[PDB]
Design a protein around this ligand. Structure first.
Ligand SMILES: CCCCCCCCCCCCCCCCCC(=O)OC[C@H](COP(=O)([O-])OCC(O)COP(=O)([O-])OC[C@@H](COC(=O)CCCCCCCCCCCCCCCCC)OC(=O)CCCCCCCCCCCCCCCCC)OC(=O)CCCCCCCCCCCCCCCCC
Ligand SMILES: CCCCCCCCCCCCCCCCCC(=O)OC[C@H](COP(=O)([O-])OCC(O)COP(=O)([O-])OC[C@@H](COC(=O)CCCCCCCCCCCCCCCCC)OC(=O)CCCCCCCCCCCCCCCCC)OC(=O)CCCCCCCCCCCCCCCCC
Ligand SMILES: CCCCCCCCCCCCCCCCC[C@@H](O)O[C@H](CO[C@H](O)CCCCCCCCCCCCCCC)COP(=O)(O)OCC[N+](C)(C)C
Ligand SMILES: CCCCCCCCCCCCCCCCC[C@@H](O)O[C@H](CO[C@H](O)CCCCCCCCCCCCCCC)COP(=O)(O)OCC[N+](C)(C)C
Ligand SMILES: CCCCCCCC/C=C\CCCCCCCC(=O)OC[C@H](COP(=O)(O)OCCN)OC(=O)CCCCCCC/C=C\CCCCCCCC
Ligand SMILES: CCCCCCCC/C=C\CCCCCCCC(=O)OC[C@H](COP(=O)(O)OCCN)OC(=O)CCCCCCC/C=C\CCCCCCCC
Ligand SMILES: CCCCCCCC/C=C\CCCCCCCC(=O)O[C@H](COC(=O)CCCCCCC/C=C/CCCCCCCC)COP(=O)(O)OCCN
Ligand SMILES: CCCCCCCCCCCC(=O)SCCNC(=O)CCNC(=O)[C@H](O)C(C)(C)COP(=O)(O)O
Lengths: 178, 88, 603, 459, 64, 103, 32
């Protein structure tokens, strides 16, 4: 989620992803730990026997029957972590994430409580106000002509500079706001 | 819930605990800043296995695009802390 | 005088006070959940008295206090019926709700909107009470829609989760499909018997025709999650565990079976509807048991168990034993609420983990939870002299010795065997093996709320079956003499299911691996019913909604016919008429032509 | 009746001589006061009517519609108070003048003991509406919408004038009492068939019937908020009221002349309910919902049984209130969002909880939930149509299911889910909008206690 | 040998079983590069318009 | 593979800022300020204002208003067996005819 | 604040027209 993607996945990345998925589904099939370890070692053995193949045509010929075999025995009800995009509690707390800018609409009577928090809030707002003016120029001078080619953003290079486009990544609500 | 607020030192201790039980690497040589491909001579598949082990141990799963570019215990700790919003 | 009516109305009234107080100051504190729990407990202990008076004398009563409106020769009034069914189901529902609320006071302590959750639970309880005590079809419909709306609101408790909204809408869809038949029955009854009141309906219909009974059966199938419309009950688990423990386990889902029970004087007079409901019950109980055999989410397994029990009581209705079905409702409430409360305890203790693949050794880690779950499972499977026995054993005995369909017989027997099998699966996979949860052990049950809530239902599921069975007057002809081999068929089939499930589950220890067969894929994917039926119809309908109805008819052809054709014709005529070069030669030639035409034509 | 008509007229000089910063207060206060005066008309008797004079009479069919019409105007003023902030004093006074003229024309229409006066005011109700739609409208399509709304209505209603003057020439009087008492059967002839069509089409076009509803989505989408509520609440009921008044002379021809319209309505209810599911706009969705409900009312009126008429009146009042509430809520959303698209703003329940409650209540009422008068009218019409034929239940049940589906879809898409990230001008809801929603919804839950007040003369 | 997965309208072909990305040619890589380029251009425009402290409205979406 | 130096530096700075922001979210002892302003026993009062009063109101309503109209409250007639005595009349229902009793 | 060109247009037989539309919808010419 954090890292920007590349235009394509190399053969190594495909092999690693297939290995991870195969191990996960094998663990789902083999409920117990000792069985899982035994069959995971067997799968690693059958996985590394073609590690040193040189030609790419045959390697691409492989990893195709491998994917077909994986799809045939994929355990149609795999194990999904509760916070995963398929888990039981995937977006459970997404209804509690209230944006930061909502605090700008609070009544002064409500702002009377928590005064120190709002003082630090004003300090953060001033910091963002200056940092944005610096960042827009830095990004303008750093990007190549014709538009960016990948969605990777550069860090801060000077001393007082801050990373471009940081406000909405730094001020995420929380993992479990309530 | 009653879940304790796990902290940075606790995360680092858990990471090193998981790594030290991986017999492919010797506990004495490993450090929080040690690499995986060069300083320990581990395979790419081995690194995937470590990532999955931390996945199982911490109860949350790391996306592949972020898991394939974690090479040191320190940056694994940093990634977990960023995921779980740890202050100190 | 005759405190029966006073107390039977006072329980329903006192259940309403916290709803009125929801706008007061106590709603803004942390005292609200305890307030609601105490109110429910007081309502239960007050409603316990009419049960005693009915048991002593056999008191029956209907109260028509407020006259709502009169439509010519029809009168609609707020009428409550307080017969055996109502006076017996009030205390059971109140007891289960009290235990569930006390459990929720611990399960949902971290939810910021806990007060709203308790208010929603109380609103659902009030609506179910209205449905149970209703005397005319309109009040029954009011309760019928209220429970469905509350289920929609409580399934989608977490608004951020998309699956919650999907499940809520799916439940509403299926309940409306059932409401189609409910409204059909209501309209038929009014237009033929000239009354929505149960008394006139019973009296004027000596031989009830097929249409109203088919409508009632469709409504019961819709709300009790029978085979045609089953998936909404397993999908309704996206809500919090207390909701699925109270609403979609034991109280709300028995509304269709209760509707069929209420109209039993008309059910007996028809033979085709009895056969249809028996077949529906048999097929649905087998299907949900078979699906539950191989499920891996604990809440899914218990939901499918609930669906199987619902099908079993539909079968009981089919063989014309409504009172036995009511008794099974009462027992199933207790032990199924127990099972869901234990599952919620495990889920909370294991950091919101629901897959049984990650539950290991909890027989020693959680002793009270495992003993409660073991007692509940043994009661569910039909262990003799327990709460589930006094209902299920009689169900199977009556089913075995009636002039019924043989395929329904076989399906019911296989269904109870599979019930034993999946109970074994739950116990073995969640309490026997070595631990499989993450290393940070956070096991803890030492909370008085959870322990007390579980132990109350424990005492209930141990003794209530005996108490209720021996403390009510007989209403069915006993099956005194039976063949010995058929007398024990329930126990033999349950033991066979236990042995087969245990032997097949013990084979997972062996270090061998094999790809699944077609039967396993069919059973795990829920007969492929949720896939196809949620992709083939919906899509097509939605497709038409944009292709034929919206764009092609409304935006293209309806526009082309009336307005666009008129606009085009008038534009063409205006262009033709107004295009004159201004030459008076042509003008006067036309004048000569029209002079000649009028001279020779109009004379 | 003049105790109602005269104050409505005096509202105009009251508005025009008010101070520049006090027009809204005076208009709202005196409109509410007028509504209280109109409440007295509700006490109808089981006998003929409240024949006030030779020109105006009140029935138990006209009383609920009159009370709703008088009650709507304060809500229209509170709704229009928002987007007219930057408007000059003269134009605001002209807007209030148009609203007052519309109310006066509707009040004079609903009693109208003579049919020609009824027709004159029934077409007079068309000028202020067109001016409101085409003048104070945001989009550039308001002109085409105004043209459609004018011509669809006028083309249908022009043969009605000829039919009425012909009836007066033959019968000798158009007073509704004389028409009802001296009614005679219509023989089965081509001339009588065309008289039936002329007398019916003028009211069926305005309801509207499926196939002639093209003007309604345009008029409802492009109009301002007040025009939208006055169209959805009262202006749609003119056709049904006229049809129930005029079907007294079309018997027994209707017994077989109702088949095309019955089939059209019973299929168009399904078609428009399905259309509501796949909609990218909120106001268009609400307009199509109104079309479906009015098609059901058409079926009820054409059945011509006492339960049909009772259900038709109840559904008229309930749908008016519900559609007005839904348009109010959509306008409040559009004012902050400035886009009018369903999926552009999401998860508003996390930011505005009370408006989420109002959305839920409005959707539940639209969903025909018991014991609200929505379901009372719905169920009465269902039973009457079932008596008409046992197969109608299939179509009606399909309509009910689709109605529930699209109502909850409207609720879920705009209220549930994760909020849109790039919108940061969702200010907390004002007291005006909350008061508007409360005043919309409380009369419905109050009328569910005394249904006999809205069940019409055949109660 | 294993039974083949036959895709349909309501059950599409998985990316892993798809054969288009196994027959890789330099023009396919160029096409993927252009796709990522235009997507990143749009993302950069949106992020520039999104983090602006001065903006106090809704970012108009031409696509919508 | 692995982090590029620019990615490492950007992630480090973002992490520092995120930790600062998260630490700033904490509330001090005086951070929450509330302005004060005012204008067996628990169960004993609870049973009085929640149980007894509804019983009184409902009993009054049923006894003197609901039962005033005919047929509003209709009770199933009690079962009569051989041998019981009726309060209203005092007559005794005759017993059975002494059926043969073995086992 | 959107120009007339941005709005959807009638299907175009010509390649030049096709290219203009593909650029309008923010996608590759041979991907449109
Ligand atoms: C069950 C009976 C209870 C009787 C007690 C008296 C209650 C009087 C209420 C009158 C109407 C309410 C006014 C509507 C707007 C509410 C104002 C508001 O903003 O709330 C904020 C306020 C403060 O909360 P907050 O934290 O500040 O705001 C945060 C957000 O608002 C977050 O808000 P939230 O999350 O807390 O949710 C708001 C809540 C409240 O919002 C609502 O939805 C209320 C409207 C529900 C009706 C939906 C339309 C369907 C048509 C029903 C028409 C019946 C009306 C009868 C006459 C009414 C007289 C006015 O919504 C719900 O809880 C879901 C309601 C769905 C219930 C479905 C069951 C309906 C049929 C039940 C049977 C009715 C007839 C019984 C006949 C047989 C028995 C005798 O909360 C409340 O005041 C809640 C009120 C209690 C809910 C009542 C729901 C059922 C009662 C309906 C009428 C009673 C019938 C008479 C029987 C007496 C015995
Ligand atoms: C009067 C005499 C009374 C005595 C009567 C007889 C006494 C007993 C005789 C024994 C009878 C069977 C007992 C064994 C049960 C089967 C267990 C087994 O072997 O499973 C392994 C094996 C495959 O397992 P796997 O893939 O290796 O598992 C992967 C791992 O183990 C993954 O494992 P996992 O950990 O994930 O979960 C394992 C789970 C997963 O296991 C499963 O896969 C579930 C599938 C097994 C359920 C089948 C049981 C009942 C079937 C009812 C079917 C109703 C009709 C449906 C018609 C469909 C037509 C297409 O299994 C279990 O947990 C326990 C299984 C249930 C056993 C306990 C209950 C069975 C006893 C009750 C049945 C008979 C007694 C009746 C008593 C009343 C007296 C009459 O299952 C089978 O091979 C299926 C055997 C039966 C299937 C029959 C359907 C064939 C239809 C083919 C087409 C026919 C033509 C249609 C033409 C249509 C034209 C329109
Ligand atoms: C404890 C009590 C509980 C119940 C309270 C009920 C109060 C009801 C008040 C609301 C009344 C609604 C308005 C009714 C208007 C219809 C009737 C009206 O048209 O009658 C007129 C008479 O109306 C009254 O004179 C004036 C009433 C107007 C005021 C009503 C009270 C509330 C007014 C509130 C205004 C604002 C208050 C101050 C705010 C700052 C003309 O009568 P008329 O046709 O000749 O009668 C002929 C028959 N006669 C000869 C036997 C009489
Ligand atoms: C498009 C959106 C909706 C718009 C409104 C739709 C509603 C308009 C439809 C008109 C309703 C019915 C019209 C005529 C009904 C009479 C019954 C007749 O049609 O049936 C046969 C009549 O036979 C033929 O139909 C003769 C008429 C044929 C010519 C009429 C045009 C038919 C198609 C045109 C459709 C265009 C409709 C829209 C126009 C813009 C029976 O023969 P017969 O028993 O001997 O005569 C009965 C009449 N008697 C007793 C007085 C003598
Ligand atoms: C409350 C605080 C006051 C407590 C002290 C007073 C205690 C009761 C004394 C009042 C006297 C009884 C009374 O209220 O009068 C009866 C009076 C009605 O008068 P009737 O003439 O009998 O019928 C109407 C036609 N004329 O009854 C009442 O209104 C009070 C009790 C009615 C039930 C309460 C309302 C519950 C239902 C709400 C509406 C729900 C929708 C409709 C339900 C649909 C049913 C098919
Ligand atoms: C005998 C003949 C009977 C004639 C009946 C007259 C029907 C009344 C409507 C006639 C409108 C015709 C005018 C027209 O369409 O002009 C084309 C015009 C061009 O736009 P302009 O603004 O004029 O130019 C700007 C660009 N340069 O096209 C349009 O835009 C049309 C927009 C409004 C259309 C409204 C149509 C609504 C009619 C609904 C049906 C009623 C028909 C009446 C007869 C019913 C059948 C018996
Ligand atoms: C949204 C657009 C809707 C358009 C609606 C237009 C159609 C309305 C129906 C027809 C309107 C004209 C009817 C005439 C008015 C009634 C007058 C009447 O009833 O008098 C008849 C006269 O009947 C007629 O003259 C009818 C002639 C019709 C001529 C105009 C035709 C208009 C179009 C006809 C087909 C439309 C029908 C379906 C329209 C559907 C909507 C598009 C009696 O004749 P007498 O002289 O008294 O004979 C007695 C001695 N034997
Ligand atoms: C229950 C489900 C069962 C599913 C079974 C799935 C099928 C199992 C059999 C799979 C067959 C294969 O291995 S398909 C073999 C695919 N072709 C190759 O592996 C050639 C060169 N491989 C590499 O270069 C990789 O990077 C590598 C060296 C592996 C790691 O490198 P690292 O140094 O960066 O870790």
């Amino acid at each position: 989620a954090f890292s920007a993607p590349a235009a394509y996945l190399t053969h190594q990345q495909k092999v690693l992803r297939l290995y991870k998925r195969a191990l996960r589904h094998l663990e789902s099939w083999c409920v117990h730990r000792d069985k899982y370890r035994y069959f995971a070692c067997l799968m690693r053995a059958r996985f590394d026997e073609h590690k040193n193949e040189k030609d790419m045509v045959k390697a691409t010929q492989l990893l195709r029957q491998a994917e077909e075999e994986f799809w045939y025995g994929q355990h149609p009800q795999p194990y999904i972590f509760p916070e995963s995009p398929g888990g039981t509690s995937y977006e459970r707390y997404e209804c509690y994430k209230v944006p930061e800018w909502c605090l700008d609409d609070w009544h002064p009577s409500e702002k009377a409580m928590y005064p120190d928090y709002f003082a630090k809030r004003e300090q953060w707002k001033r910091l963002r106000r200056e940092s944005w003016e610096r960042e827009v120029k830095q990004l303008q001078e750093e990007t190549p002509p014709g538009g960016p080619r990948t969605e990777a953003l550069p860090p801060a290079r000077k001393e007082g500079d801050l990373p471009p486009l940081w406000w909405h990544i730094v001020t995420r609500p929380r993992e479990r706001p309530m | 819930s009653d879940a304790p607020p796990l902290t940075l030192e606790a995360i680092k201790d858990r990471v090193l605990y998981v790594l030290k039980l991986y017999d492919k690497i010797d506990p004495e040589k490993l450090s929080v800043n040690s690499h995986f491909m060069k300083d320990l001579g581990l395979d790419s598949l081995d690194q995937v296995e470590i990532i999955m082990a931390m996945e199982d141990e911490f109860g949350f799963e790391i996306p592949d695009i972020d898991a394939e570019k974690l090479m040191c215990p320190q940056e694994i700790v940093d990634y977990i802390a960023d995921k779980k919003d740890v202050y100190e | 005088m005759n405190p029966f009516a006073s107390l039977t109305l006072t329980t329903l009234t006192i259940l309403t006070i916290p709803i009125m107080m929801s706008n007061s100051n106590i709603y803004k504190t942390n005292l609200y959940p305890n307030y609601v729990k105490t109110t429910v407990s007081y309502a239960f202990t007050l409603s316990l008295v009419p049960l005693l008076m009915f048991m002593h004398t056999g008191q029956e009563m209907i109260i028509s206090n407020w006259h709502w409106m009169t439509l010519q020769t029809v009168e609609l009034s707020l009428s409550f019926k307080m017969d055996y069914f109502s006076v017996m189901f009030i205390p059971v529902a109140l007891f289960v709700t009290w235990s569930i609320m006390e459990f929720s006071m611990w399960y949902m302590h971290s939810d910021p909107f806990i007060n709203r959750f308790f208010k929603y639970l109380l609103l659902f309880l009030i609506t179910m009470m209205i449905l149970v005590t209703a005397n005319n079809l309109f009040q029954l419909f009011i309760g019928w829609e209220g429970v469905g709306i509350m289920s929609f609101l409580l399934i989608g408790w977490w608004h951020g989760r998309t699956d919650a909204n999907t499940a809520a809408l799916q439940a509403i869809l299926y309940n409306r499909i059932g409401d189609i038949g409910f409204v059909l029955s209501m309209a038929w009854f009014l237009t033929h018997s000239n009354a929505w009141d149960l008394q006139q309906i019973f009296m004027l219909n000596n031989e009830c025709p097929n249409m109203p009974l088919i409508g009632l059966l469709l409504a019961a199938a819709g709300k009790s999650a029978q085979f045609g419309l089953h998936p909404w009950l397993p999908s309704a688990m996206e809500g919090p565990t207390p909701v699925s423990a109270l609403l979609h386990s034991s109280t709300m889902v028995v509304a269709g079976v209760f509707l069929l029970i209420r109209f039993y004087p008309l059910m007996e007079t028809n033979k085709l509807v009895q056969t249809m409901t028996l077949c529906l019950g048999a097929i649905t109980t087998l299907f949900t048991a078979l699906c539950a055999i191989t499920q891996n989410d604990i809440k899914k397994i218990v939901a499918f168990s609930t669906s199987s029990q619902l099908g079993l009581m539909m079968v009981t209705i089919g063989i014309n034993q409504p009172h036995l079905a009511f008794l099974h409702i009462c027992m199933h409430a207790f032990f199924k609420a127990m099972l869901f409360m234990c599952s919620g305890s495990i889920i909370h203790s294991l950091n919101d983990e629901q897959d049984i693949r990650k539950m290991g050794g909890l027989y020693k880690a959680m002793p009270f939870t495992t003993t409660a779950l073991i007692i509940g499972s043994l009661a569910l499977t039909g262990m003799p002299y327990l709460t589930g026995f006094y209902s299920k054993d009689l169900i199977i005995e009556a089913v075995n010795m009636s002039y019924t369909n043989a395929w329904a017989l076989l399906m019911t027997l296989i269904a109870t065997s599979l019930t034993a099998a999946y109970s074994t699966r739950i116990i073995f996979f969640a309490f026997l093996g070595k631990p499989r949860f993450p290393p940070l052990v956070l096991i803890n049950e030492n909370n008085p709320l959870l322990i007390n809530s579980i132990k109350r239902l424990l005492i209930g599921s141990i003794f209530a079956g005996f108490i209720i069975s021996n403390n009510i007057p007989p209403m069915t002809v006993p099956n005194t003499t039976m063949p010995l081999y058929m007398k024990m068929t329930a126990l033999i089939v349950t033991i066979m299911g236990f042995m087969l499930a245990l032997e097949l589950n013990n084979t997972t220890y062996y270090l061998k691996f094999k790809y699944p067969s077609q039967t396993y894929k069919f059973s795990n994917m829920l007969g492929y019913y949720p896939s196809i039926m949620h992709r083939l119809p919906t899509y097509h309908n939605l497709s038409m909604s944009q292709k034929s109805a919206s764009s092609l008819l409304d935006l293209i052809w309806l526009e082309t016919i009336l307005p666009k054709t008129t606009s085009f014709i008038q534009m063409k005529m205006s262009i033709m008429v107004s295009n004159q070069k201004g030459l008076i030669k042509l003008y006067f030639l036309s004048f000569l032509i029209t002079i000649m035409i009028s001279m020779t034509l109009f004379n | 009746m003049l105790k109602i008509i005269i104050p409505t007229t005096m509202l105009l000089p009251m508005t025009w001589m008010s101070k520049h910063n006090m027009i809204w207060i005076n208009a709202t206060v005196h409109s509410l006061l007028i509504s209280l005066i109109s409440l007295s008309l509700l006490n109808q008797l089981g006998e003929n009517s409240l024949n006030f004079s030779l020109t105006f009479f009140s029935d138990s069919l006209s009383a609920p519609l009159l009370v709703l019409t008088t009650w709507l105007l304060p809500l229209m003023l509170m709704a229009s108070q928002s987007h007219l902030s930057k408007e000059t004093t003269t134009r605001k006074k002209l807007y209030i003048t148009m609203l007052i003229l519309l109310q006066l024309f509707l009040i004079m229409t609903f009693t109208a003991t003579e049919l020609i006066l009824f027709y004159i005011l029934f077409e007079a109700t068309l000028v202020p509406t067109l001016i409101i739609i085409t003048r104070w409208g945001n989009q550039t399509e308001r002109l085409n919408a105004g043209l459609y709304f004018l011509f669809y209505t006028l083309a249908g209603s022009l043969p009605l004038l000829v039919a009425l003057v012909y009836i007066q020439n033959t019968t000798g009087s158009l007073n509704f009492l004389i028409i009802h008492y001296w009614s005679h059967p219509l023989s089965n002839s081509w001339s009588n068939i065309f008289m039936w069509l002329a007398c019916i089409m003028a009211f069926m076009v305005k309801m509207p019937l499926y196939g002639l509803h093209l003007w309604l989505p345009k008029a409802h989408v492009e109009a301002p908020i007040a025009g939208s509520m006055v169209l959805a609440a009262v202006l749609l009921k003119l056709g049904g009221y006229g049809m129930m008044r005029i079907t007294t002379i079309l018997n027994p021809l209707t017994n077989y002349m109702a088949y095309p319209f019955l089939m059209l309505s019973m299929w168009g209810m399904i078609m428009t309910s399905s259309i509501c599911l796949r909609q990218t706009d909120l106001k268009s969705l609400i307009a199509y919902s109104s079309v479906s409900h009015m098609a059901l009312v058409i079926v009820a009126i054409m059945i011509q049984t006492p339960w049909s008429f009772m259900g038709a009146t109840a559904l008229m009042i309930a749908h008016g209130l519900t559609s007005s509430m839904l348009f109010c809520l959509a306008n409040t959303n559009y004012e902050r969002v400035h886009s009018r698209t369903m999926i552009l703003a999401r998860g508003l329940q996390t930011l505005l909880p009370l408006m989420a409650t109002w959305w839920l209540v409005a959707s539940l009422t639209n969903l025909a939930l018991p014991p609200s008068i929505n379901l009372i009218g719905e169920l009465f019409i269902i039973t009457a149509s079932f008596s008409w034929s046992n197969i109608t239940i299939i179509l009606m049940g399909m309509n009910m299911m689709i109605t529930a589906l699209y109502s909850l879809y409207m609720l879920i898409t705009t209220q549930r889910g994760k909020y849109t990230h790039h919108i940061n001008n969702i200010k907390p809801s004002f007291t005006r909008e909350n008061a508007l929603m409360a005043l919309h919804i409380l009369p419905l839950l109050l009328l569910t206690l005394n249904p006999k007040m809205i069940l019409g003369p055949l109660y | 040998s294993f039974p083949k997965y036959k895709p349909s309208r309501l059950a599409t072909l998985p990316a892993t079983l798809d054969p288009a990305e196994y027959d890789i040619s330099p023009e396919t890589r160029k096409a993927q590069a252009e796709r990522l380029a235009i997507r990143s251009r749009l993302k950069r425009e949106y992020l520039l318009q999104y983090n602006d402290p001065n903006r106090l409205g809704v970012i108009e979406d031409p696509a919508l | 593979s692995g982090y590029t130096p620019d990615e490492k530096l950007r992630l480090q700075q973002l992490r520092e800022l995120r930790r600062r922001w998260l630490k700033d979210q904490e509330l001090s002892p005086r951070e929450p300020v509330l302005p004060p302003r005012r204008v067996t026993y628990r169960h004993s009062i609870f049973a009085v204002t929640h149980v007894l009063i509804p019983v009184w109101i409902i009993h009054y309503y049923l006894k003197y208003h609901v039962t005033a109209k005919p047929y509003t409250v209709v009770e199933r007639k009690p079962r009569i067996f051989p041998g019981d005595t009726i309060l209203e009349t005092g007559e005794v229902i005759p017993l059975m005819k002494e059926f043969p009793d073995q086992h | 604040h959107v120009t007339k060109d941005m709005f959807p247009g009638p299907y175009p037989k010509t390649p030049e027209e096709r290219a203009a539309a593909a650029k309008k919808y923010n996608m590759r010419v041979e991907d449109y």
